[PDB]
Amino acid sequence: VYLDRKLLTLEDKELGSGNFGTVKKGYYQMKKVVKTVAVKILKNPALKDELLAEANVMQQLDNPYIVRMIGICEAESWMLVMEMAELGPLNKYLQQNRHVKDKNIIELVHQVSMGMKYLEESNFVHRDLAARNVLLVTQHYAKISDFGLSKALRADENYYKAKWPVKWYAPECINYYKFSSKSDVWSFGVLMWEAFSYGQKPYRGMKGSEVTAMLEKGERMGCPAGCPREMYDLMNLCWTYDVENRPGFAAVELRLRNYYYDVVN
Ligand SMILES: Cc1cn(-c2ccnc(Nc3cc(C)c(OCCN4CCCC4)c(C)c3)n2)cc1CN1CC(O)C1
Secondary structure, rough: OOOOOOEEEOOOOEOOOOOEEEEEEEEOOOOEEEEEEEEEOOOOOOOOHHHHHHHHHHHHHHOOOOOEEEEEEEEOOEEEEEEEEEEHHHHHHHHHOOOOOOHHHHHHHHHHHHHHHHHHOOEOOOOOOOOHHEEEOOEEEEOOOOOOOOOEEEOOOOOOOOOOOOHHHOHHHHHOOOEHHHHHHHHHHHHHHHHOOOOOOOOOOOHHHHHHHHHHHOOOOOOOOOOOHHHHHHHHHHHOOOOOOOOOOHHOOOOHHHHHOOOOO
């Protein structure tokens, strides 16, 4: 799972840019066929362990609706090589594809729920589940990306305990610093609202404490325009305040599954 640098060929263009460095499109030369890849390149304080951690999480993961890691490449700077989802972030796609029918959005978010169902079974917490971190291969095929804040849970516990996306975070994450798969279900609820709002930002114009204050009164984001009423119930079900009463992805996937096939039938 260590890749040869002379086989890789990177573009000059950047896809994304953070403190890590860059994300660039490229081509990894396989047996005969050449595979297209998205490569996360590094920019020097020992934040190289953070990248190794992300690679180590993706190494263990293996699922249709998760971004696959091809391997690591030590050359000039550290590089996390992944398979290429050509259409990009879900939020940005839906922003500039308003024609996308509501059936198609149910399909795309149900795919995310199945990836998180696997993530829950595999005992990993994502901790950054947003519409920006869902990448599209096709209009009808999504993958969950960005495992930089992801943690593998121990066999005895069922939460991790700790620059946060407060708008995607559950009450227990803000108050108690406790991250479980139920905390990701909360984030999936915000991700659903994002998708049915066509990539609109949640809690628009509000600060973290104002969002925290709003949610404590029992006030939740309203049903976005054209969103099916059964899908909006699932958002509010994902936004259960109590951690224990909130459903896991098994339940979230099962409702999205059943509802989806009453639309296509
Ligand atoms: C670690 C990582 C892997 N990737 C990946 C992983 C696999 N595939 C891709 N493909 C991809 C990724 C992006 C960010 C993307 O948008 C760049 C295209 N946008 C259009 C105009 C500005 C850039 C497109 C069209 C394709 N990215 C992205 C990231 C960074 N995450 C994505 C999240 O938004 C920040």
